[PDB]
Amino acid sequence: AGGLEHRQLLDLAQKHFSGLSGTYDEDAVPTLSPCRFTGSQICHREDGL
Amino acid sequence: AEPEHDHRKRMGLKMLLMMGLLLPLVYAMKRHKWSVLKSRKLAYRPPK
Ligand SMILES: CCCCCCCCCCCCCCCC(=O)OC[C@H](COP(=O)(O)OCCN)OC(=O)CCCCCCCCCCCCCCC
């Protein structure tokens, strides 16, 4: 973001990022599992504060 | 000597049935609220 043409950013991308692995592993693609929310409570009692 | 005999026995039956309902339900309400405390876990981490 700033004073720059989108063209030059794409050129620099193909110039300095083409050397990057775009081929994932056979079955090692990470997938985010949903995270269980839990109604709960945590109380760190510290009266010195 | 006890004209209320028959009516009292009918009431006694209704009292036992309602108590057989209300006692476990009210017991369940007690444990429901108290479960917050009965499963609470404590840990002590003093500075050393
Ligand atoms: C101004 C009012 C002041 C009231 C003060 C009352 C003090 C509390 C005394 C507690 C009495 C226990 C119930 C008596 C049942 C009875 O005796 O009822 C007899 C009746 C049948 O009657 P029936 O066969 O004629 O058919 C009726 C005509 N259709 O079924 C019962 O058993 C119901 C009772 C179920 C078992 C008891 C459950 C206790 C719950 C507590 C609720 C208390 C309310 C508090 C009110 C102040």
Curated annotation (Swiss-Prot), chain A:
Superkingdom as given in the UniProt entry: Eukaryota
Name of the protein this chain belongs to: Cytochrome b-c1 complex subunit 1, mitochondrial
Modified residues (N6-acetyllysine): K15
Subunit structure: Component of the ubiquinol-cytochrome c oxidoreductase (cytochrome b-c1 complex, complex III, CIII), a multisubunit enzyme composed of 11 subunits. The complex is composed of 3 respiratory subunits cytochrome b, cytochrome c1 and Rieske protein UQCRFS1, 2 core protein subunits UQCRC1/QCR1 and UQCRC2/QCR2, and 6 low-molecular weight protein subunits UQCRH/QCR6, UQCRB/QCR7, UQCRQ/QCR8, UQCR10/QCR9, UQCR11/QCR10 and subunit 9, the cleavage product of Rieske protein UQCRFS1.
Role: Component of the ubiquinol-cytochrome c oxidoreductase, a multisubunit transmembrane complex that is part of the mitochondrial electron transport chain which drives oxidative phosphorylation.
Compartment annotation: Mitochondrion inner membrane
Family statement drawn from the similarity comment of this UniProt entry: Belongs to the peptidase M16 family. UQCRC1/QCR1 subfamily.
Swiss-Prot record, chain B:
Mitochondrial matrix side: 39-48
Transmembrane regions listed in the UniProt entry: 5-38
Top-level taxon of the source organism: Eukaryota
Subcellular location(s) of the protein: Mitochondrion inner membrane
Role summary: Component of the ubiquinol-cytochrome c oxidoreductase, a multisubunit transmembrane complex that is part of the mitochondrial electron transport chain which drives oxidative phosphorylation.
Assembly notes: Component of the ubiquinol-cytochrome c oxidoreductase (cytochrome b-c1 complex, complex III, CIII), a multisubunit enzyme composed of 11 subunits. The complex is composed of 3 respiratory subunits cytochrome b, cytochrome c1 and Rieske protein UQCRFS1, 2 core protein subunits UQCRC1/QCR1 and UQCRC2/QCR2, and 6 low-molecular weight protein subunits UQCRH/QCR6, UQCRB/QCR7, UQCRQ/QCR8, UQCR10/QCR9, UQCR11/QCR10 and subunit 9, the cleavage product of Rieske protein UQCRFS1.
Family the entry assigns: Belongs to the cytochrome c family.
Protein name stated in the entry: Cytochrome c1, heme protein, mitochondrial
Organism of this sequence: Bos taurus
Annotated gene: CYC1
Residues of the full protein shown: 278 to 325 of 325
